[PDB]
Design an enzyme around this catalytic site. Structure first.
Site, PDB file in Angstrom:
ATOM      1  N   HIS B 149     -37.982 -18.693 -12.704  1.00  0.00           N
ATOM      2  CA  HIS B 149     -38.450 -18.093 -12.197  1.00  0.00           C
ATOM      3  C   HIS B 149     -39.918 -18.428 -11.083  1.00  0.00           C
ATOM      4  O   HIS B 149     -40.077 -18.408  -9.610  1.00  0.00           O
ATOM      5  CB  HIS B 149     -38.706 -17.085 -11.907  1.00  0.00           C
ATOM      6  CG  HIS B 149     -38.733 -15.973 -11.277  1.00  0.00           C
ATOM      7  ND1 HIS B 149     -37.772 -14.897 -10.271  1.00  0.00           N
ATOM      8  CD2 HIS B 149     -40.311 -14.880 -10.500  1.00  0.00           C
ATOM      9  CE1 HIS B 149     -38.704 -14.226  -9.724  1.00  0.00           C
ATOM     10  NE2 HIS B 149     -40.438 -14.286 -10.053  1.00  0.00           N
ATOM     11  N   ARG B 182     -45.027 -12.392 -13.988  1.00  0.00           N
ATOM     12  CA  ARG B 182     -44.465 -13.232 -15.631  1.00  0.00           C
ATOM     13  C   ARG B 182     -45.302 -13.506 -16.020  1.00  0.00           C
ATOM     14  O   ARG B 182     -45.755 -12.789 -17.384  1.00  0.00           O
ATOM     15  CB  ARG B 182     -43.742 -13.913 -14.847  1.00  0.00           C
ATOM     16  CG  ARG B 182     -42.741 -13.999 -14.214  1.00  0.00           C
ATOM     17  CD  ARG B 182     -41.537 -13.339 -13.962  1.00  0.00           C
ATOM     18  NE  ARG B 182     -40.581 -12.719 -12.861  1.00  0.00           N
ATOM     19  CZ  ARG B 182     -39.455 -12.438 -13.392  1.00  0.00           C
ATOM     20  NH1 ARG B 182     -38.471 -12.709 -13.774  1.00  0.00           N
ATOM     21  NH2 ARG B 182     -38.520 -11.656 -11.931  1.00  0.00           N
ATOM     22  N   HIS B 188     -43.047 -14.410 -19.556  1.00  0.00           N
ATOM     23  CA  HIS B 188     -44.124 -15.412 -20.175  1.00  0.00           C
ATOM     24  C   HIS B 188     -44.819 -15.550 -20.668  1.00  0.00           C
ATOM     25  O   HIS B 188     -45.727 -15.166 -19.742  1.00  0.00           O
ATOM     26  CB  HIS B 188     -43.479 -16.651 -18.519  1.00  0.00           C
ATOM     27  CG  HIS B 188     -41.944 -16.825 -18.740  1.00  0.00           C
ATOM     28  ND1 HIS B 188     -40.763 -17.845 -18.448  1.00  0.00           N
ATOM     29  CD2 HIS B 188     -41.080 -16.156 -17.614  1.00  0.00           C
ATOM     30  CE1 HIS B 188     -40.130 -17.729 -18.865  1.00  0.00           C
ATOM     31  NE2 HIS B 188     -40.312 -16.788 -17.492  1.00  0.00           N
ATOM     32  N   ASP B 192     -46.207 -21.849 -19.439  1.00  0.00           N
ATOM     33  CA  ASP B 192     -44.669 -21.116 -18.836  1.00  0.00           C
ATOM     34  C   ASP B 192     -44.564 -21.711 -17.183  1.00  0.00           C
ATOM     35  O   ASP B 192     -44.114 -22.709 -16.582  1.00  0.00           O
ATOM     36  CB  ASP B 192     -44.387 -20.374 -19.402  1.00  0.00           C
ATOM     37  CG  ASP B 192     -43.150 -20.264 -20.338  1.00  0.00           C
ATOM     38  OD1 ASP B 192     -43.684 -20.977 -21.371  1.00  0.00           O
ATOM     39  OD2 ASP B 192     -43.358 -18.916 -20.973  1.00  0.00           O
TER      40      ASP B 192
END
Lengths: 232, 232, 232, 232, 232, 232
Positions: B149, B182, B188, B192
């Site tokens: 994403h 995120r 995450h 990440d």
């Protein structure tokens, strides 16, 4: 935030495509660097120490050689990864392209954050030399964040990857490793290098909007196509 | 390393411009994720905890909303930063462009590293929900590194910045913040997201070599030029 | 910084000697609390965990009992350390003195910093109960820094030490331990308690400038002198 | 614990109001200093490093100047915060008051803990100089915990705040910063300074029980009242 | 893993009982040493610093003396713990036994892991001397993990404990402390010493299978029995 | 220190060779366990978390199976490493040998340290189950340091290695891994296991002084020699 005063295409058209107004707002985009007392800075120190122990390896030798590079030497430093010489002799249009974006990626894309934080560099923090210098040599002690050299390295990698997609992964790895060499040598903290790749990628987007860059990029691609024909 | 088996332009031409052979070698390019017991992972945990405490703020509300986004919703999520609606209604050529690179940035650019490490995601590590779900909802627990994403977010930001350089900084900040959302939501680890921006930037270089992308990008720019004329 | 709006001697003359204008500028005086990601906060967490493991000891039993104390119960909690009952029954002038400074030390001396940071308390951070409550009981989750109760404890100790210097060390230890009990029980982080002793000591200086406090302090001393005569 | 042998009012009546028997039991009251290998000590080191980087700022210049202060110079160092000169020339009664408690706060209040732990000071731990010395100058390497100078600073602040409550916050901030200056300069660990404020506050309570202190304090207040009249 | 090339009983029968084929597979048995950036290494550094501060104590004096020991001096270093002189003069059979296993415990039991990791030693990591040397003296900078000397120390302790079980605890403590002396002096990281005791214990099991060791061990026991008779 | 009261050869001659007086002084020999707030304990927690993430791997399956072992099951758990069944059926003399030292290694060698520290075990610290239990099953929450099971495992490995030196490395690895299985499963902290191998090795030296052990060991070796003949 407005970019601090400095050079751009209007003062050094051979080293910048972009104006001050077109600079990446590095101060607004990047987080602040890790503060002393943060886990993030403790990790920067871990990477510094890791790097220091790598100095007496083959990778350390490469790091010292990479650390000897000026902004202008970055283009040629991609030659092996690129698969052919990136020189004024062999690829003048390509070398011109990459040289002319040094200021955009190294200066404009970093200036706001650099001047705000004036972050102390690792060797200065520890009161020691870098891997490729003694204390008879003199380096700037501050302005560590983000790394201008690393921004040039990564921006250059992204442009080179577009010109020679068949070796994009070798090119990208090389660009990445130019940053890591500076961590190994004590020129920059890991976070300086991490941040540099953000703004380095950002400036490449801006450059794609610039007519002069677009033209010169096409010339570099045309030149490369001829280089490929003569090699094959 | 070769990209693991999966979809590409030959199977899903509406979601990828690129083939498996053109994928960024994420496994070779990225470092491994922080290991448990590393200072780097301790920092990931610090960012997780920081994020967790931000969940009940305005920024946390935005994070939960961002975390609700599917890969296909990323394009429209840039509308405010871009300065005009990025929708199928208002900007079909632009929306098509950004949708068609979802697979390239989200999948191809991350697959090698994702499948090698199969990294456990924060919410799964702690045995809790994310900021926008309860345990009645089900999410994949692994494949955290790098964030697909976030790679889409950053790649999309770089493309959008090229289309509308007048708002490049707003666009880039928005793309950056999609990643941070995120981290805040527990989807995450910070690392990440950091890693995702590397491969996200890399894939944009590849995309610039692709005829279909080049054409569609120009259509998006032509469309935007008309949008500007009608607004002014 | 000006103290935020609230009660003082003009609204609650039985609980404050001082006005809002006489409050310690806790926001200006204290450093900010440790941020998530700082070594300082990691230490706060260490002290939280240490405290948690002490809950099932004799010291933990004392901590739970101390944690049951309201601001008004602090005075009497010094009885054993003081060497005689601090009660309305046995020492009305002393009990009045200590009760009447609850607002000064607990509220005025902490309010600026409390309201600025609205720091999350340990039990709330971990999503658990304290040592003396289950989740059927409800406590404020924020405003942790500095600890009002601890400020009252320390201020009270300093005043009591002046009244009975022969047991100053027992008194001071008791005042100190009231703070540590809150760390053990999960009500406050160690840094909340550390900060509280700074402002707690500061307010005692202010109180010494106040005619009503001076008078009541003398009454408490006169009363204590009689208590000593009747004991001996 | 009994205070170790040393000077008091019976040997140096110009530097102490109190006897050895009246000393704060610093060994019993204070926790032990952070041990090497503790998170608490890691934080002390973080504050040392933070301090070190502040040495070349305006705050660092102030820290070096503060670090030049002997125990006898503390009183005058409050002049700007106090709003008028604290000198033998301009405020003899005040200067006498503050000088005469140097031993009580600096020595008696710290001696037990100092001599038990004989804690190594930061500059000695790192094998370097402080911010205001080279290695041609010689300082005691141990007895770091708690800081005598900081105890004097804080005790002096509390007394001064009582004399001039209109500037209590400026006075308290100044007293606090005297401690922090020692952290910045490498004379003391943060925890030495934190601990010093505990015993510094404690001794002020004892001093309020002492007839000679009470008398001299009143003289200082009378003197200050005249200073105010002549200024206005 | 096969043991790397080197000496054994076939080349130095006075220093080894065992062959290369009988060596403990230290590479397979031991975990890798802590990596820079691990919490484990941060603890190694804590123990290094703790050790460094102990250098100027009685325990530090013992550490420096222990650090002066060659492999051949280990046997005699157990004399006080053993309760009688372990010398060629007074206990030739015992001294022969312990000397003849130096290679087995110091070399064979450590060689695989030593040569694989070639770990940098503490003094070399910090660029300083050890507690018992200046930089005019020269020591190997690498091969830290595991500690050969410590392996000899622990193996020797286990053998000695079998010969004189009445003082097994004194003997074992002494053997343990030989390892810790190397941590205090900066010769080895704590983890080098921890790992050494694993392989040191392992080799003693192998030695018990060896006829020459069995015979010499019995001679040492017979000799000790006579030593006991003459003492009593 | 004297061993605390408990069983020995005089009460359970089938489970101990040694008397209480012959016990390893574990309290005197071992360091204390890591304290909360130490880097050492932070590493214990890292190993706990690492272990937790390994629970859903093949190594985790082995860990759960190892964690199901009682003290009496340890002997048989070496069968694959040993190269032949260690059972009452197939190797009664060997199984008797190893069973009869369970108390010596598991209890006598650990009791002093166990009872002094009564260290909380990982699963209890975190308020969760182990890898092989739910909360319907009940385990002792304290006495973690050192690990009795691990001491038995390591002592058993050392004895087995002496009996079958041809597979000493497989045997030693197996003994080591029995300890690590307990870390993976949440039964013990890494430091519990590290400490256990020290005392486990120590007790094997004592056992070699014991006539009954010596005899039974020889019987096990004689038995093994026959097992080898029938296999070949």
């Amino acid at each position: 935030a407005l970019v601090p005063p400095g050079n751009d295409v209007t003062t050094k058209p051979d080293l910048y495509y972009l104006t001050n107004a077109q600079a990446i707002d590095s101060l607004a985009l990047l987080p602040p660097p890790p503060a002393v007392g943060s886990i993030a800075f403790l990790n920067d120190q871990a990477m510094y120490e890791q790097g220091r122990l790598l100095r007496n390896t083959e990778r350390g030798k490469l790091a010292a050689e990479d650390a000897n590079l000026s902004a202008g030497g970055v283009a040629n430093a991609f030659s092996s990864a690129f698969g052919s010489p990136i020189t004024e002799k062999d690829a003048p249009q390509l070398h011109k392209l990459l040289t002319n974006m040094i200021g955009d990626a190294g200066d404009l894309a970093t200036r706001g954050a650099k001047e705000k934080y004036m972050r102390i560099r690792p060797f200065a923090f520890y009161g020691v030399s870098t891997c490729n210098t003694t204390e008879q040599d003199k380096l700037s002690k501050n302005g560590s964040y983000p790394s201008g050299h690393t921004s040039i390295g990564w921006a250059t990698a992204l442009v080179l990857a577009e010109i020679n997609p068949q070796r994009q992964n070798e090119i990208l790895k090389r660009g990445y490793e130019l940053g890591e060499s500076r961590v190994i040598c004590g020129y920059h903290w890991q976070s300086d290098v991490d941040a540099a790749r953000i703004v380095g990628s950002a400036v490449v987007a801006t450059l794609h909007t610039n007519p002069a860059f677009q033209q010169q990029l096409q010339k570099a691609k045309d030149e490369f196509a001829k280089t490929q024909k003569h090699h094959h």
